[PDB]
Write an enzyme that holds these catalytic residues in place. Structure first.
Site, PDB file in Angstrom:
ATOM      1  CG  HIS A 150      -0.553   0.249   2.465  1.00  0.00           C
ATOM      2  ND1 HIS A 150      -0.238  -0.787   3.306  1.00  0.00           N
ATOM      3  CD2 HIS A 150      -0.258   1.408   3.135  1.00  0.00           C
ATOM      4  CE1 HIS A 150       0.219  -0.283   4.432  1.00  0.00           C
ATOM      5  NE2 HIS A 150       0.223   1.046   4.364  1.00  0.00           N
ATOM      6  CG  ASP A 165      -0.038  -4.206   2.760  1.00  0.00           C
ATOM      7  OD1 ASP A 165       0.227  -3.502   1.742  1.00  0.00           O
ATOM      8  OD2 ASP A 165       0.055  -3.790   3.965  1.00  0.00           O
ATOM      9  CB  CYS A 173       2.698   0.146   7.779  1.00  0.00           C
ATOM     10  SG  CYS A 173       0.943   0.157   8.220  1.00  0.00           S
TER      11      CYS A 173
END
Lengths: 229, 6, 7
Positions: A54, A89, A159
């Protein structure tokens, strides 16, 4: 909360582990494009940086990469070679030759049900980046095993940080998301035969200019949004 | 459940 | 300050 009894010396929790070899490979990434800016972390390995797919919600600007060797800026993100990890992801960026490569000593493997993991990061605001390790959580797959659950408190912007097994020091995934109440956390698991992918160019499928085209995606049985509320 | 990238 | 890579 548990007072041990009727034990074997080997039943004790693992002793000190040096997480600096992992934290020394962590980079902070900022993709600035179209009036937006997305920051999160990646893990360096050779000429690659392993990070969240992402990060590329957009791909039309610049990428600032903060690492042990300093700060480097990619002028045009569309020039970066990318290898997509199908249905997860996760993506691998190949950095250009003028970016100092990382060593290739890290070990990655798929997570194992119920194993103990911790989250490892690096603090870049300190003059000299410093390694950080969280407390330990057990882990379980959510659905098909794409996303795995973990119960480590994470702040916005973490993240891409590696989840590391306290059992063998291998990286088993990267932090990705949380539910709306920040009560359940999820990391994207390292896929099967990941070491082969990192070390065998025949296995790599490089493309450039790739981006996502929406504000939510359906991966591993979960609908995931780019932004909360 | 619905998730959000953090 | 940031090192600009060659692109």
């Amino acid at each position: 909360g548990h007072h041990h009894h009727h034990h074997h010396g080997e039943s004790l929790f693992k002793g000190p582990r040096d997480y600096n070899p992992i934290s020394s490979t962590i980079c902070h990434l900022t993709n600035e494009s179209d009036g937006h800016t997305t920051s999160l972390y990646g893990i360096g390995f050779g000429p690659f940086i392993i990070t969240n797919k992402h990060l590329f919600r957009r791909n039309n600007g610049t990428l600032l990469v903060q690492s042990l060797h300093g700060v480097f800026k990619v002028k045009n993100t569309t020039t970066l070679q990318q290898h997509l990890i199908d249905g997860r992801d996760m993506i691998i960026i190949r950095m250009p030759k003028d970016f100092p490569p990382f060593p290739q000593k890290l070990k990655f493997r798929e997570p194992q049900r119920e194993e103990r993991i911790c989250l490892v990061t690096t603090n870049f605001q300190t003059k000299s980046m410093s390694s950080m390790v969280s407390d330990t959580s057990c882990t379980f797959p959510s659905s098909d095993g794409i996303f795995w659950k973990h119960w480590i408190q994470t702040k916005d912007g973490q993240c891409g940080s590696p989840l590391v097994s306290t059992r063998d020091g291998f990286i088993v995934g990267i932090h990705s998301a949380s539910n709306f109440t920040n009560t359940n956390n999820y990391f994207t698991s390292v896929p099967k035969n990941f070491m082969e992918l990192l070390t065998n160019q025949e296995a790599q499928q490089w493309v450039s200019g790739w981006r996502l085209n929406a504000d939510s995606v359906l991966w591993g049985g979960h609908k995931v949004f780019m932004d909360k509320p | 459940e619905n998730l959000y990238f953090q | 300050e940031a090192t600009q890579l060659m692109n």
